[PDB]
Amino acid sequence: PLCFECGQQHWTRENHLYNYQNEVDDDLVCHICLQPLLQPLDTPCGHTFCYKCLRNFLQEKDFCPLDRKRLHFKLCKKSSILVHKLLDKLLVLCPFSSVCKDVMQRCDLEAHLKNRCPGA
Amino acid sequence: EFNPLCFECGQQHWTRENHLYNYQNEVDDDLVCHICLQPLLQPLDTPCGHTFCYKCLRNFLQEKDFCPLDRKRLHFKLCKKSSILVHKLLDKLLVLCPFSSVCKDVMQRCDLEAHLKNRCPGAS
Ligand SMILES: [Zn+2]
Ligand SMILES: [Zn+2]
Ligand SMILES: [Zn+2]
Ligand SMILES: [Zn+2]
Ligand SMILES: [Zn+2]
Ligand SMILES: [Zn+2]
Ligand SMILES: [Zn+2]
Ligand SMILES: [Zn+2]
């Protein structure tokens, strides 16, 4: 029942999971989940969180945790092209370490699993 | 005392021009301004999702009407300051002190101003 895009187990409401080769810069790491950002949203207060993390968080809380400012999900916007580019190229290891020792950009893992990986 | 060096970056430039830095390492091309071809300073985001230096874009839009990457209509007033995270990534780029004859310190870009003010033997 593994995710077909990332090769790991998770709910739809939760992020894909990755095993990153290197230590990712803290500023690309989501404050909520403490993993590198996925589908980043910018807040009006200038902070950035995962779509899924922020959607889930705003069901329970109504303030940005970094600045305590009021936060509405509908006012959050997709982060810039630049930010998405930096996140896409982050290096990950294939989760099927039993057979596969491939290392690739995060945005490329899905195609590897769907088309090429014998472990998937 | 006449036409002195910038107090904040230690290099010679006019106020309408960007600060200047000597980068220690290759900077990721995604953090480089397409207009000036240096690492972004005071990044602004366009409605088309692109990012340029505040001073480069303002100068560019004086006689131009569009985004240099995609030629979509572009107005300076519709541009916005880039996210905190983009600023934070840029701040940590390593630079060399410009006063290379007397000082060999390497530091994060955001720290150069404080270095010149509080530490450098080469500043005035
Ligand atoms: Zn997944
Ligand atoms: Zn997150
Ligand atoms: Zn905030
Ligand atoms: Zn594989
Ligand atoms: Zn300067
Ligand atoms: Zn520029
Ligand atoms: Zn554009
Ligand atoms: Zn110095």
Author numbering:
A (entry chain A): 2 to 121
B (entry chain B): -1 to 122
The publication says:
The domain architecture for these proteins shows the presence of a RING domain (Really Interesting New Gene) and one to four PDZ (PSD-95, DlgA, ZO-1) domains. LNX2 is an E3-ubiqutin ligase known to interact with Numb and with a similar protein, Numblike.
LNX2 (20-147 aa) exists as dimer in the crystal, with two molecules in the asymmetric unit. The structure consists of a core RING domain (Asp46-Arg90) flanked by two zinc finger motifs on either side (hereafter referred to as the Zn-RING-Zn domain). The core RING domain of LNX2 adopts a typical RING fold, comprising one central α helix, two antiparallel β strands and two long loops. Notably, Lys109 of one monomer makes hydrogen-bonding contacts with Asp45 and Asp47 of the other monomer in the dimeric Zn-RING-Zn domain.
